[PDB]
Design a protein around this nucleic acid. Structure first.
Ligand SMILES: [Mg+2]
Ligand SMILES: [Mg+2]
Ligand SMILES: [Mg+2]
Ligand SMILES: [Mg+2]
Ligand SMILES: [Mg+2]
Ligand SMILES: [Mg+2]
Ligand SMILES: [Mg+2]
Ligand SMILES: [Mg+2]
Ligand SMILES: [Mg+2]
Ligand SMILES: [Mg+2]
Ligand SMILES: [Mg+2]
Ligand SMILES: [Mg+2]
Ligand SMILES: [Mg+2]
Ligand SMILES: [Mg+2]
Ligand SMILES: [Mg+2]
Ligand SMILES: [Mg+2]
Ligand SMILES: [Mg+2]
Ligand SMILES: [Mg+2]
Ligand SMILES: [Mg+2]
Ligand SMILES: [Mg+2]
Ligand SMILES: [Mg+2]
Ligand SMILES: [Mg+2]
Ligand SMILES: [Mg+2]
Ligand SMILES: [Mg+2]
Ligand SMILES: [Mg+2]
Ligand SMILES: [Mg+2]
Ligand SMILES: [Mg+2]
Ligand SMILES: [Mg+2]
Ligand SMILES: [Mg+2]
Ligand SMILES: [Mg+2]
Ligand SMILES: [Mg+2]
Lengths: 197, 68, 125, 145, 54, 229
RNA sequence: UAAGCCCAAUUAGUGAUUGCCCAUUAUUCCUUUGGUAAGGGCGGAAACAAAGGAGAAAGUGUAGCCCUUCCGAUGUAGAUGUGGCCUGGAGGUUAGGACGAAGCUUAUGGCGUGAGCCUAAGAUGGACCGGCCUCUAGUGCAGAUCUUGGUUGGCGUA
RNA sequence: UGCAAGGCCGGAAAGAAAAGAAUUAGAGGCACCAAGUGGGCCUUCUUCGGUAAGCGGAGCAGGCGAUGCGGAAUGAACCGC
RNA sequence: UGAAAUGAGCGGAGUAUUUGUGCUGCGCACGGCGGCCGCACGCACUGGUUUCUUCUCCGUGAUGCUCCAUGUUGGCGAUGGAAAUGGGGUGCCCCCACCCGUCUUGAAACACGGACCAAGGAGUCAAACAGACGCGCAAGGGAGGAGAUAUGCCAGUACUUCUCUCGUACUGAAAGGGAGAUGCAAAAUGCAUCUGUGGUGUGCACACGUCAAAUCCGUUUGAUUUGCCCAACACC
């Protein structure tokens, strides 16, 4: 025997295959597994891992956010160079709060119809990953982006709302029911809003 | 019938199975709430001035870069 | 046709794993069942008791599923099924299903002789 | 349009050409040189394909799908019959002209067809000699019309 | 254990389920397409009867 | 015939073969020179100490030997019923199995650790023959997290990527003399796995002074390990 | 003249270092299985008819795409996985049967670690039914002083 | 132009020497969902009540429970593993 | 049993190199005495000598991705009611071996349920909520009820409007109120522009340099500088 106490606690849970049933997703996974194995770019490896990931971990992104980050990168770029291609492993959605945008080249798994119309009208192009693999096989001159995950209702609900320093929402259908005792100083006590950690 | 009252026999082993985790480093969660108020107020005035200086500095960098 | 030669078959264990105390009760089948009694001597691995199956008894992957003749069995039901085995006739041998009648068996046996395909349950020849 | 890669994903687990008996997976696709259920050997699915088949007498016939009329099933496969005595290398070169990755398997299949033809003649003659010493009691003939 | 769940109010404490001792109190919609067909047929017949009035 | 991409593969492979042969010949010459240098150093040191001892005795004085700098430690007990403090130390020494063996520096931080787990170990001061036998016969390296037996000098050179460690005699010299790369060499090796001693032990439950086995037995450890290697 | 107690040896003031026996432990060899696993190959090199052979899938999981290498493997209550096994019915697809379907019998062997699957024989039977992909459920028994039917030692006994 | 606080600019940095002058089968951090359990018992050292108990009650650690295998003739907990 | 023999071992060519022992030179080092005397033979000059001792130097990539396939001498086997090798059955010998299920700290127990076989026999259906995973659309998503005509084989499928519902905004007991950035400035509803992360610290990829190690010389594997920093965390 060999003393290997608590050795199973160093194992990590990682997904090695997709749970999706989409044949086009499977084709993309095949192509980018080949590219990641046979090239020396970190871009391909990151893209392959994100393609493997699940739907909840592939949050969508906003066209306005894309425009803002592209502008903040472009303000410090020489005028003799071309703007990078935005790349999102996920969905791109339109934004009504911003009406004027520059011409951008965007590659994504899926576009909403409004977002596609807005990009084309501004004067950009919508690309797919198979087109990207031919335009830039190693991912040179790209801009990898992710969508926002905090702000989801589930995240806002995570935790216990009755302990000091917590601001999570309780699971309740009647908004006016869980007030009074434990939430007001006049009713016995009030949950403390702040606590040093 | 009577039973066991209290013991601490196995508790140390349970606490070390997932280890006793160390403290959070000092540069995180260093909130100043509840400290001596007169010093807190004066520090707020300085931080407000610094933010305005940071915005001005970025504008100068942009203009210089555009001029090449 | 002669089967392709492989290395010697080992067969780690030949006796079957039978249920505990099935010989004392007529209604109990010999099919294996995992004993889950709290005081069971088979589950607790006493020296003079029956053994239990586990992964260590697995067969060599080089010689797995190979019959004593050296072929591997592939069930067939009619004459057209023989053409699947034409190229790989040194690896697979056909097995005629039990419910195929005597009239149809005559055509299957006659055709397999010409194609040089081995039948596990043919007749004479 | 719809590529071979997409189609192979759709039919890999379920097809009328896939024979999964016992634990063995085989194929009864008429355009398969091996009987193995792989994407390379699925002749009914690839854009181009070639297969070696026997012909009447002792000849060897090569069926070729050139990929120019895949939307017309009646005109998809074209046959080129070669008389007996053709070298197996010549048959493989005909296959290699349309798919270089089937040269080795088509060479072996050409030799296998020739050996079968000679064996069939030898077996038939021996069976006829045995049948000539038996009186029998019934014999049927198809009507000529 | 119970954990963190919503406090349930499912309102099913009366004898609503038909069993060996209760008649129950339920309503199902298994006749919906048949009734739709019947209503359309009745409308067509009534129109034929009162022709040519709207 | 061969066309296009099949040609430059053949030419590049042809250059790879000749470069491999040239590199192997150069490494063999380097290992020859270093082995000759080390052997002369070992003999010269022994003759120097012999003369020094003779000079002290002729005039009625004494010669004090240098304190040992390297120890060799082997575990002689199983994995059952070990207290938490002893368990932690045996893991930091990489002695997780019975008859595992390691080389450690015999300094003050290490000496106090060996004292706390004395009933589980037997240790002493190794000789040149003992160090050489363990490396050549029981030597394994850690390559990509795998336990790989040493079979040629090119494997050693690739693992360490240091100009001072290119051959098996370099590893022996660093361990025996406690060189500046002592930690690098020993950390890169898998713990040694040995057989039980042929002929048996006396009593694993008593100290060597009491007629048992555990504890510090000085240079007599070499006779113990000679029956295990 | 211990086969008892206290010391002390290993073939004995002769020549220097291990008397012998017994493990699910240690070292080493073969095989299986699973990895926080580590690598390589996958543009068919050329040539080759019977009268050196086959294979070569860009791949979680198979009769594992193929090859090399290293490490771990017991376990009550409990959790999870399985191109993991079995039963009644439905949508498809592919077969079988009076030259004998289902059911039933076995010193009938073969395969699988196993749940089980398949063949042989019936000097059995007489009309239906197998495989594969999906769907579905009143879907797997050794014991509940378990339910119903039948049988049984006590016994040719009281 | 001293002290306190938040920043900006610049320099240096055996990346930690030598004196016994560490070591690691040494990837850190952060979450979500949920089971069983909530009668324990034994031993080593330290102990409180009791004349004492195979008695009652505690501290540190290791075990049986949940576990065989090799030994003490036989034994849940002893020795080895 | 040579279907890759990598060999101090197979092949080829030389038959001399150079390891140690012995003897010995100079300078340094070491010991003793107070610079001289000693050096057992330490370091450098790869110091000299050859008296003994010892062999030395070259050589075969895969144009083979993987698996299988090759010696010698006798016995048995010449198609049989044959031989041989595996299975299967019954007996015997040496060794090993307490009755299952269960509650329990503890069962084999003088603890409970246990004569045999067949058939039957126990986590299901509905509703509210939440998390993980699959699918469609997305600042919007979706009904339901009902109608209309293909439709008069068909309890299915195909089609439809308003509306309704969840969400895009929250807060107060209530009357009520209701969230951009920058610049100038300091008005009890200030003014002006609208290609834009409110700020700071830590932070994938990409771009610009530099340094190591390896290299078949084409490039790889690691570090780091600077810019922008995506997701995310902390402090404002
Ligand atoms: Mg929000
Ligand atoms: Mg209690
Ligand atoms: Mg078996
Ligand atoms: Mg128990
Ligand atoms: Mg070729
Ligand atoms: Mg609880
Ligand atoms: Mg002993
Ligand atoms: Mg002890
Ligand atoms: Mg293994
Ligand atoms: Mg297990
Ligand atoms: Mg039913
Ligand atoms: Mg029987
Ligand atoms: Mg049931
Ligand atoms: Mg039953
Ligand atoms: Mg130091
Ligand atoms: Mg309880
Ligand atoms: Mg008690
Ligand atoms: Mg219990
Ligand atoms: Mg034990
Ligand atoms: Mg006794
Ligand atoms: Mg030689
Ligand atoms: Mg028993
Ligand atoms: Mg009791
Ligand atoms: Mg019991
Ligand atoms: Mg009793
Ligand atoms: Mg009871
Ligand atoms: Mg709406
Ligand atoms: Mg309107
Ligand atoms: Mg809201
Ligand atoms: Mg309101
Ligand atoms: Mg108020």
């Amino acid at each position: 025997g060999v003393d290997l106490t608590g050795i199973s606690k160093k194992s990590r849970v990682i997904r090695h295959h997709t749970y999706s049933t989409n044949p086009y997703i499977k084709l993309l996974i095949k192509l980018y597994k080949f590219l990641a194995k046979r090239t020396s770019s970190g871009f391909n490896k990151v893209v392959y891992q994100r393609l493997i990931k699940s739907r909840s971990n592939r949050a969508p992104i906003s066209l306005s956010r894309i425009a803002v980050v592209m502008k903040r990168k472009a303000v410090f770029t020489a005028k003799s160079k071309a703007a990078p291609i935005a790349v999102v492993v996920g969905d791109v959605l339109d934004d009504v709060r911003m009406a004027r945008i520059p011409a951008m080249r965007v590659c994504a798994l899926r576009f909403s119809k409004s977002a596609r119309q807005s990009i084309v009208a501004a004067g950009g192009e919508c690309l797919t990953f198979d087109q990207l693999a031919m335009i830039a096989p190693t991912g040179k001159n790209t801009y990898l982006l992710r969508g926002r995950k905090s702000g989801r209702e589930s995240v806002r609900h995570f935790g216990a709302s009755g302990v000091p320093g917590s601001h999570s929402k309780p699971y309740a259908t009647n908004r006016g029911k869980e007030t009074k005792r434990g939430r007001r100083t006049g009713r016995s006590y009030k949950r403390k809003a702040f606590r040093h950690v | 019938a009577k039973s066991k009252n209290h013991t601490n026999h196995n508790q140390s082993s349970k606490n070390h199975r997932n280890g006793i985790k160390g403290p959070v480093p000092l540069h995180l969660h260093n909130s100043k709430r509840g400290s001596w108020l007169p010093a807190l107020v004066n520090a707020r005035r300085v931080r407000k001035h610094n933010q305005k200086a940071a915005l001005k500095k970025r504008r100068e960098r942009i203009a210089a870069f555009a001029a090449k | 046709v002669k089967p392709t030669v492989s290395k010697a078959i080992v067969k780690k264990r030949t006796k079957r794993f039978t249920r505990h105390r099935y010989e004392l009760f007529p209604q109990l089948s010999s099919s294996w069942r995992k004993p889950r009694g709290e005081d069971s001597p088979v589950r607790r691995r006493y020296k003079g008791q029956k053994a239990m199956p586990n992964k260590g008894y697995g067969s060599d992957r080089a010689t797995k599923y190979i019959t004593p003749s050296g072929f591997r069995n592939f069930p067939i039901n009619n004459v057209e099924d023989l053409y699947m085995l034409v190229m790989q006739n040194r690896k697979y041998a056909g097995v005629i299903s039990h419910t195929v009648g005597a009239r149809k068996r005559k055509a299957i046996v006659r055709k397999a002789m010409e194609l040089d395909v081995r039948l596990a349950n043919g007749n004479a020849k | 349009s719809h590529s071979v890669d997409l189609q192979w994903v759709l039919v890999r687990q379920n097809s009328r050409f896939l024979q999964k008996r016992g634990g063995i997976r085989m194929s009864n696709d008429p355009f398969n040189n091996n009987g193995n259920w792989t994407k390379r050997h699925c002749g009914f699915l690839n854009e181009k394909a070639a297969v070696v088949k026997p012909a009447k007498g002792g000849a060897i016939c090569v069926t070729v799908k050139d990929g120019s009329s895949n939307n017309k099933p009646r005109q998809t496969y074209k046959k080129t019959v070669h008389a007996a005595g053709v070298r197996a290398s010549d048959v493989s070169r005909a296959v290699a002209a349309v798919r270089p990755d089937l040269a080795d398997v088509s060479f072996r299949r050409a030799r296998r067809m020739a050996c079968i033809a000679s064996r069939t003649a030898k077996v038939a003659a021996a069976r006829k000699a045995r049948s000539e010493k038996i009186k029998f009691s019934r014999k049927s003939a198809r009507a000529k019309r | 254990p119970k954990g963190n769940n919503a406090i349930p109010h499912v309102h099913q404490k009366k004898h609503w389920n038909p069993c060996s001792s209760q008649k129950g109190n339920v309503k199902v919609f298994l006749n919906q397409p048949a009734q739709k067909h019947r209503r359309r047929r009745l409308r067509l017949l009534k129109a034929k009867k009162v022709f040519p009035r709207p | 015939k061969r066309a296009a991409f099949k040609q430059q593969q053949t030419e590049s492979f042809k250059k790879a073969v000749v470069a491999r042969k040239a590199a192997k010949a150069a490494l063999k010459k380097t290992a020859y020179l270093r082995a000759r240098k080390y052997s002369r150093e070992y003999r010269g040191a022994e003759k120097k100490l012999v003369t020094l001892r003779r000079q002290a005795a002729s005039h009625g004085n004494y010669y004090l030997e240098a304190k040992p700098k390297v120890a060799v430690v082997t575990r002689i007990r199983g994995i059952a019923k070990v207290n938490p403090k002893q368990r932690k130390i045996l893991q930091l020494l990489r002695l997780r199995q019975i008859f595992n063996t390691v080389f450690v520096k015999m300094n003050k931080p290490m000496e106090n650790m060996l004292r706390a787990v004395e009933p589980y170990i037997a240790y002493g001061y190794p000789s040149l023959a003992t160090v050489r036998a363990m490396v050549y016969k029981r030597g394994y390296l850690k390559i990509n997290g795998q336990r790989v037996k040493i079979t040629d000098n090119q494997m050693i050179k690739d693992k360490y990527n240091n100009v001072d460690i290119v051959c098996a005699e370099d590893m022996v010299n660093q361990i025996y003399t406690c060189g500046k790369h002592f930690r690098t060499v020993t950390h890169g090796m898998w713990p040694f796995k040995l057989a039980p001693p042929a002929g048996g032990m006396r009593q694993k439950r008593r100290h060597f002074v009491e007629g048992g086995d555990y504890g510090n037995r000085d240079t007599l450890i070499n006779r113990f390990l000679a029956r295990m290697i």
